[PDB]
Design an enzyme around this catalytic site. Structure first.
Site, short mmCIF file in Angstrom:
data_model
loop_
_atom_site.label_atom_id
_atom_site.label_comp_id
_atom_site.label_asym_id
_atom_site.label_seq_id
_atom_site.Cartn_x
_atom_site.Cartn_y
_atom_site.Cartn_z
N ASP A 296 0.95 -1.21 0.01
CA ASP A 296 0.12 0.03 -0.09
C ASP A 296 1.04 1.32 -0.02
OD1 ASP A 296 -1.44 2.27 0.80
OD2 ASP A 296 -1.89 1.48 2.70
N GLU B 55 -3.37 4.21 -2.44
CA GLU B 55 -4.07 3.93 -1.24
C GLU B 55 -5.65 3.91 -0.97
OE1 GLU B 55 -2.64 6.14 2.46
OE2 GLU B 55 -2.54 3.96 3.55
N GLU B 56 -6.22 5.08 -1.38
CA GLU B 56 -7.61 5.34 -1.19
C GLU B 56 -8.21 4.22 -2.15
OE1 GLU B 56 -5.33 7.81 -2.11
OE2 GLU B 56 -5.59 9.52 -0.72
N1 LIG Z 1 -3.41 -0.90 -8.34
C1 LIG Z 1 -2.21 -0.36 -8.71
N2 LIG Z 1 -1.25 -1.37 -8.74
C2 LIG Z 1 -0.08 -1.12 -9.19
N3 LIG Z 1 0.63 0.16 -9.32
C3 LIG Z 1 -0.25 1.20 -9.16
C4 LIG Z 1 -1.75 0.90 -8.66
N4 LIG Z 1 -2.37 2.20 -8.82
C5 LIG Z 1 -1.30 3.15 -8.96
N5 LIG Z 1 -0.21 2.49 -9.30
C6 LIG Z 1 0.88 3.19 -9.64
O1 LIG Z 1 1.73 3.63 -8.61
C7 LIG Z 1 2.03 4.85 -8.54
C8 LIG Z 1 2.32 5.72 -7.21
O2 LIG Z 1 0.71 5.72 -6.92
P1 LIG Z 1 0.39 6.79 -5.62
O3 LIG Z 1 -0.98 6.49 -5.21
O4 LIG Z 1 0.53 8.20 -6.39
O5 LIG Z 1 1.36 6.92 -4.53
P2 LIG Z 1 2.50 7.64 -3.65
O6 LIG Z 1 3.25 6.86 -2.83
O7 LIG Z 1 3.36 8.90 -4.95
O8 LIG Z 1 1.37 8.66 -3.28
C9 LIG Z 1 1.20 8.32 -1.84
C10 LIG Z 1 0.19 9.45 -1.54
N6 LIG Z 1 -1.15 9.23 -2.21
C11 LIG Z 1 -2.24 8.72 -1.33
C12 LIG Z 1 -1.50 8.18 -0.10
O9 LIG Z 1 -2.54 8.10 1.00
C13 LIG Z 1 -0.30 9.24 0.31
O10 LIG Z 1 -0.99 10.55 0.43
C14 LIG Z 1 0.77 5.43 -9.67
O11 LIG Z 1 1.32 6.76 -10.15
C15 LIG Z 1 0.94 4.47 -10.90
O12 LIG Z 1 1.99 4.71 -11.57
#
Ligand SMILES: Nc1ncnc2c1ncn2[C@@H]1O[C@H](COP(=O)(O)OP(=O)(O)OC[C@H]2NC[C@H](O)[C@@H]2O)[C@@H](O)[C@H]1O
EC number: 3.2.1.143
Length: 508
Positions: free
Chosen positions: A282, A300-301
């Protein structure tokens, strides 16, 4: 090619890779809220203790049903729980009814909380038959499970506070009752912007889900109502474990003589659909769940929405420090989705096919590890920051006293590289290093980026063929910082990390 590296079939997966679980029992570092002697496949768990016991203190959740949950009456004290019961037990026929009900025991937020999304969902998105099902069936069943709380969550729930190594195992039914309370915004001391006690904990009450006119609110609400309809129509029978993990000792990475482990990397698939039996990452906020109960709708959400049992971690999980993680075993997937962020849509109900383990937990292990949020690109190559990310991922991956043979692969991807601004190629190397130290293989999903897949694969195979150790590679990262980052006065360095590494290794 859609995937590269070790074939996925060669990777380890639960439950088959797992050691036999010891007997579930409560102890000093494990809170268990059900009758373990009575735990049986297909039966709703029996709460332990049999009758409600209350703790209203610094070390436990303040339950809405506490006799100490009081409100000043206009100059006396009155029972908030009685007020909640009075408020929620009226019939709802229009969205204002639900708002007025919730506000009765939240009088101080009667002008601060907006309910536009709730009203608009009910009035302006739902069809008539859907609205009627909502107010005649789903909402009144949610009220009933919410008000059963003192019969369901009979045992005080310890806060997973900073530096605690502690687990909580509770039933999905217990979680449903608690999450129905959060929806009705009944948890005390979790609302004030100038709060002290819970200022280091995430939001738990769902009021910010009813705010504003974002077109994603109908999608969040539909995902949650899918969950609430399922768990109030038929009680779930499994358990869920929440474990805070804080490591004291971290590697001297520069000296680490462990070899890299195996990698499978693919631009197709997702962690949640294609990481079955693997440690699922996550991409967390330090306040676990991020914006799930407000406007967040990224990785995450989305996971917290489709597996809503995750959200309850917010009730008891204090903000993660740099050496901590949260590990959740047994959450169930209740919905499917399409899209992402401002294109996210609830698709349909999901029938989770996961096996359960000997403690009746779905065989789904999720670890919340929060990357750093980098405002400037070069910030992340500073060695303190590289070391921080290694140690975070290591804490997420490491399972003290479990042998390597019984460790599933890590299902991860672009950790910290969307909203948090990280460089994917650097983080991928960081996760490979951490996984290697924890003695686990890596299954890496690049989420549609085929070039990144090739790039991660090629580097990984290049370092493996040359037999570079975790230390050899970390030293290379430190070299990149000193030569290309430390006094680069411009936004981007002159040469990128991977070309640097290739050149540094082949010329040595
Ligand atoms: N289901 C899934 N599987 C795999 N990879 C994914 C998926 N969904 C998104 N991604 C990839 O992971 C990347 C990172 O996702 P992100 O939600 O932006 O993670 P971060 O760690 O950068 O952001 C964390 C922050 N966002 C929500 C959290 O509560 C933090 O505040 C996103 O740009 C995609 O390329």
């Amino acid at each position: 090619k859609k995937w590269l590296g070790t074939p996925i079939e060669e990777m380890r997966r639960m439950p088959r890779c797992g050691i036999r679980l010891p007997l579930l029992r409560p102890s000093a570092n494990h809170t268990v809220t059900i009758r373990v002697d009575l735990l049986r496949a297909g039966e709703v768990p029996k709460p332990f203790p049999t009758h409600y016991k209350d703790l209203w203190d610094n070390k436990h959740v303040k339950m809405p049903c506490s006799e100490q949950n009081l409100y000043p009456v206009e100059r006396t004290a009155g029972s908030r729980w009685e007020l909640i019961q009075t408020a929620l037990l009226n019939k709802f026929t229009r969205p204002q009814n639900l708002k007025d009900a919730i506000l009765k025991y939240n009088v101080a937020y009667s002008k601060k909380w907006d309910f536009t999304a709730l009203i608009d969902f009910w009035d302006k998105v739902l069809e008539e038959a859907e609205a009627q099902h909502l107010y005649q069936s789903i909402l009144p069943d949610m009220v009933k499970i919410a008000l059963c709380l003192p019969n369901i969550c009979t045992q005080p729930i310890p806060l997973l506070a900073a530096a605690m190594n502690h687990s909580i195992t509770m039933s999905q039914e217990q979680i449903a009752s608690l999450l129905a309370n959060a929806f009705f915004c009944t948890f005390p001391r979790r609302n004030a912007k100038m709060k002290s006690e819970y200022s280091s904990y995430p939001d738990i009450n769902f009021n910010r889900l009813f705010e504003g006119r974002s077109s994603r609110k109908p999608e969040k609400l539909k995902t949650l109502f899918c969950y609430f309809r399922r768990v109030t129509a038929a009680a779930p029978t499994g358990l869920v474990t929440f474990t805070r993990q804080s490591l004291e000792d971290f590697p001297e990475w520069e000296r680490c003589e462990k070899p890299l482990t195996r990698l499978h990397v693919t631009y197709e698939g997702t962690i949640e659909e294609n990481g079955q039996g693997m440690l699922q990452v996550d991409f967390a906020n330090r306040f676990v769940g991020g914006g799930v109960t407000s406007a967040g709708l990224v990785q995450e959400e989305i996971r917290f929405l489709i597996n809503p049992e995750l959200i309850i971690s917010r009730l008891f999980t204090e903000v993660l420090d740099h050496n901590e993680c949260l590990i959740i075993t047994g959450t169930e997937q209740y919905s499917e989705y399409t899209g992402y962020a401002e294109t996210y849509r609830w698709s349909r109900s999901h029938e989770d096919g996961s096996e359960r383990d000997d403690w009746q937990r779905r065989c789904t292990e999720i670890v919340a590890i929060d990357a750093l949020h980098f405002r400037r690109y070069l910030d992340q190559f500073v060695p303190e920051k590289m070391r921080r990310e290694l140690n975070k991922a290591y804490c997420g991956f490491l399972r003290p006293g479990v042998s390597s043979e019984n460790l599933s692969a890590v299902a991860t991807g672009n950790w910290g590289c969307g909203a948090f601004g990280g460089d994917a190629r650097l983080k991928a190397l960081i996760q490979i290093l951490a996984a290697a130290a924890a003695e686990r293989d890596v299954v890496y999903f690049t989420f549609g980026d085929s070039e990144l897949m090739r790039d991660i694969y090629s580097m990984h195979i290049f370092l493996t063929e040359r037999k570079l150790t975790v230390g050899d590679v970390y030293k290379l990262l430190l070299r990149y910082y000193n030569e290309e980052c430390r006094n680069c006065s411009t936004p981007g360095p002159d040469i990128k990390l991977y070309p640097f590494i290739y050149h540094a290794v082949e010329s040595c």
